Structure 1
Amino acid sequence: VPETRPNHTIYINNLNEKIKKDELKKSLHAIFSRMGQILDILVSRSLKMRGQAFVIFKEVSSATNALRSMQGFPMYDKPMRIQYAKTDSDIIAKMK
């Protein structure tokens, strides 16, 4: 079951795996900066992290609006799947 506690960070998957890391981050920043101020965007090249990304917002209200408003938003011909990131995700701690 996905995380139900609102997190500053949203977890995104089903991203187009053809796009390189830096371009994916620039596009995500363009789409999600409209939900609120972004502190960081985490993308890994690892094999188990492809098609996935984290967006860390300065305020939970921005993350919540992103989750409710950008769910299924089509990018690179693929609808994004968004969840609240796991509370104190081990992945975020290492990546940030």
Structure 2
Amino acid sequence: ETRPNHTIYINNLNSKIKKDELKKSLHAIFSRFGQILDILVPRQRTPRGQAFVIFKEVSSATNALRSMQGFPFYDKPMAIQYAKTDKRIPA
């Protein structure tokens, strides 16, 4: 169960890409949709090609999810969903 929120969850990412470059590249491509609060690439026991992009506005997440769904990124089609739980930290 997911519903629109600030955070998109991306997998099927190319796991050979260095994490720093991956973050820069995700930021460059997804910043077009709106301001990004953070990009998380969680460390796991093995590389699994997963990341979260946290937008400042939900509409940005909505349009990013629609527009980039299945779009090639480093030669792999992105699989995007809304995050099950918003990663936004509104403190």
Tell me the TM-score normalised to structure 1 length: 0.84
Partner of 2:10: 12
Cα 1:45–1:87 change in 2 (3 A) is closer
5+ long unaligned stretches in structure 1? none
| Gapped regions of structure 2 (runs ≥ 5) | none
1:39-78 to structure 2, matched below 5 A, reads 39-47=37-45, 50-78=48-76
Percent identical among aligned pairs is 85
Q: Quick one: structure 1 residues 10 and 49, their matched pair in 2 at CA, closer, same or farther if it must change by over 3 Å?
A: farther
Structure 1 residue ranges (4+ consecutive) displaced by more than 2 angstroms after TM superposition: 47-50
C-alpha contact (below 8 Å) 1:10/1:54 kept by paired residues:
yes
Q: 1:37 aligns with which of 35, 38, 46?
A: 35
Over the aligned positions, Cα root-mean-square deviation in angstroms equals 1.7
Does the 8 Å CA contact 2:15/2:47 hold for their aligned counterparts?
Answer: no
Shift of 1:35: 0.9
Distance 2:44 2:85 in 1: 22
Please report the TM-score for the alignment, with normalisation by the length of structure 2.
0.89
Query: What is the rounded CA distance, in whole Å, between the counterparts of 1:81 and 1:47 in structure 2?
Result: 21
- Count residues in correspondence: 88
- One-letter code aligned to 2:43: R
Aligned with residue 77 of structure 2, among 66, 74, 79: 79
